[PDB]
Amino acid sequence: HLSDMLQQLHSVNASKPSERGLVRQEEAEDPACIPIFWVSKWVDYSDKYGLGYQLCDNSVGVLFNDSTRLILYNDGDSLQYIERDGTESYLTVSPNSLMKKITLLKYFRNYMSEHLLKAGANITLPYLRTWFRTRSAIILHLSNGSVQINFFQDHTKLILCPLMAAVTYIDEKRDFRTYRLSLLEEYGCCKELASRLRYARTMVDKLLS
Amino acid sequence: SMWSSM
Secondary structure (H helix, E strand, O other): OHHHHHHHHHHHHHOOOOOOOOOOHHHHEOHHHOOOOOEEEEEEEOOOOEEEEEEOOOOEEEEEOOOOEEEEOOOOOEEEEEOOOOOEEEEEOOOHHHHHHHHHHHHHHHHHHHOOOOOOOOOOOOOEEEEEEOOOEEEEEEOOOOEEEEEOOOOOEEEEEOOOOEEEEEOOOOOEEEEEHHHHHHHOOOHHHHHHHHHHHHHHHHHHO | OEEOOO
């Protein structure tokens, strides 16, 4: 579904959506397309352990440096462990081979409950497949096909879902708006969103590379 | 290291 979101981004970037006489972004908004999940907080500790993150439902997960993952549901007890090959195991916090990974999940659980800003905090199962950082953004790929790109300098964020063929844009003032990508070609959009959609394309290419 | 917004 990376290839699907590639064709979706190419289709809108090819229409030059900011280069229109009278742009009308608002006609492309579709609340029904709003994503169920996104990343609300993250901590890059990949020099030692991996990357820890929270999802908007307050569940937490870690993508460990050995490409395994541990996910703790928002009931604080139910666990999922994901091996490198993708094998999924259902655990509870309460096997012994994972005691080291669980005690690191706890560090990240403690961190997320107390420390960072919740992206999308106003608004009311997948795991981090992979991620990377560039000089200007962190790029997060979830197992449900969503791709999230957070931009460091101005805190804007894109959430791309290839299933709804939609993009959610969170701007610097934290305005959360979701758009059908097909309708962005029709009605156009501002230069700031069109720039980030061009960036997303180079980032999905890299995800595909 | 690095972290999301504080």
